[PDB]
């Protein structure tokens, strides 16, 4: 069994619908639902948590005055079920704020650290879905990376656009986020780590690998 956190950006920018028929929020929710359905129908023993960032309310163990705001643990590290499918389909809505993705990463890491205690997993995994529109702080990022390595956590980033035809009108903040993702993945896995950065279009199959 593996332990997976789906770390999903639900911030306001994700709701903007200007590519195809679905906004990035709708696309990411669909992938999440299809993945969870696959896991349920297959009777997989993997445990799957869901952390949302950009939520209007805050609900996580690290939250305090000005810390880890607008990040919510929607599902703890457990086998998935149909209640979760129903819960995600009808509850998970776009947020009206933005949040710091490295705060969300830390919340996800803390969730794994606590809830895998004393148990054996084949891998620990965090999959981030985001358009990288939100600002973030790099404070103590070197410690985040050190702890990702120590815990042997694998990281995947999924974006609603390619980062390799016409340019796609990415903001400076999105370009900064892309570069930071590249810095993190290179820090974890060198050149091979940069290959762990994917599109929403490819995300469902890359999760199942």
């Amino acid at each position: 069994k593996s332990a997976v956190v789906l770390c999903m950006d639900v911030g306001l920018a994700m709701s903007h619908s200007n590519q195809g028929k679905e906004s990035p929020f709708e696309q990411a929710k669909k992938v999440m639902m299809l993945f969870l359905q696959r896991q349920v129908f297959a009777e997989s023993k993997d445990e799957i948590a869901v952390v949302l960032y950009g939520t209007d309310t805050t609900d996580n163990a690290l939250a305090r005055e000005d810390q880890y705001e607008n990040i919510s643990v929607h599902r703890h590290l457990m086998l998935p079920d149909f209640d979760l499918l129903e819960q995600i389909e009808n509850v998970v809505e776009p947020g009206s704020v933005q949040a710091d993705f490295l705060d969300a990463l830390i919340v996800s890491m803390d969730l794994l650290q606590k809830e895998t205690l004393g148990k054996k997993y084949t891998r620990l995994h965090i999959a981030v879905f985001s358009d990288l529109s939100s600002p973030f702080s790099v404070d103590q990022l070197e410690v985040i990376i050190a702890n990702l390595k120590k815990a042997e956590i694998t990281l995947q980033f999924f974006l609603p656009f390619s980062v390799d035809g016409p340019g796609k009108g990415l903001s400076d903040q999105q370009k900064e986020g892309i570069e930071m993702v590249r810095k993190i993945m290179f820090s974890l896995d060198g050149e091979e780590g940069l290959s762990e950065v994917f599109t929403f279009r490819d995300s469902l199959e890359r999760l199942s690998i």
């Binding site: 710091d100 490295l102 830390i106 803390d110 702080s137 790099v138 404070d139």
Partner: peptide
């Protein structure tokens, strides 16, 4: 830069 406070286990 905005300072964050990491959980104690990360600072071990």
């Amino acid at each position: 830069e905005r300072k964050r406070i990491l959980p104690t286990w990360m600072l071990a």
